[PDB]
Design a protein around this ligand. Structure first.
Ligand SMILES: O=C(OCCN1CCOC1=O)c1ncnc2[nH]ccc12
Length: 167
């Protein structure tokens, strides 16, 4: 038993709620919050900008040191950094951004990173400003992640659409 509240169960291991991941993180303080990162860990907008803002830019400062030491991530890849005031850890995961022209097949590889963590609070990868179909992102999540994932979907109308179309 964990501390997540009001999630709709979708599968054995996937749960979903209409909420801002930032607000869910501040309330729950999960072991792992997933960031919808880019390969440069430049946290400007959407999930990344919102989480980073909630850390008072400490996420960005830590990220810049990570990139200076290690270079960029791969599309489909991830790294574990601090969760700052929001979580114990932040798993920065790079889903493909089709608005930038990347391969959607890499979305499954991106979700595979979640399997290295027993429980995660996460957003819908490659959706929103990343340009991919959200119904598809949810399907890939359910068909790829085997650990316990609590999905926060910020957009009320998107949430309604995802629940009503879920197979
Ligand atoms: O951007 C997010 O996810 C992608 C799908 N979208 C687009 C806008 O609304 C959505 O749900 C998202 N999710 C959960 N918490 C969030 N806090 C800020 C952004 C955000």
């Amino acid at each position: 038993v964990n501390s997540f509240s009001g999630y709709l169960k979708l599968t054995d291991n996937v749960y979903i709620k209409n909420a801002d991941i930032v607000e869910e993180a501040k309330k729950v303080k999960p072991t792992v919050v997933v960031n919808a990162a880019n390969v440069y860990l430049k946290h400007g907008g959407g999930v990344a900008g919102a989480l980073n803002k909630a850390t008072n830019n400490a996420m960005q400062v830590e990220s810049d040191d990570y990139i200076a030491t290690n270079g960029p991530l791969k599309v489909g890849g991830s790294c574990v950094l601090s969760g700052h005031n929001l979580a114990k850890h932040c798993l920065h995961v790079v889903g493909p951004n089709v608005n930038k022209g990347e391969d959607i097949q890499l979305l499954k590889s991106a979700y595979e990173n979640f399997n290295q963590h027993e429980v995660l609070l996460a957003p819908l990868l490659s959706a929103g400003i990343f340009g991919a179909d959200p119904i598809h992102s949810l399907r890939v999540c359910v068909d790829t992640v085997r650990t316990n994932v609590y999905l926060a979907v910020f957009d009320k109308n998107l949430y309604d659409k995802l629940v009503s179309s879920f197979l």
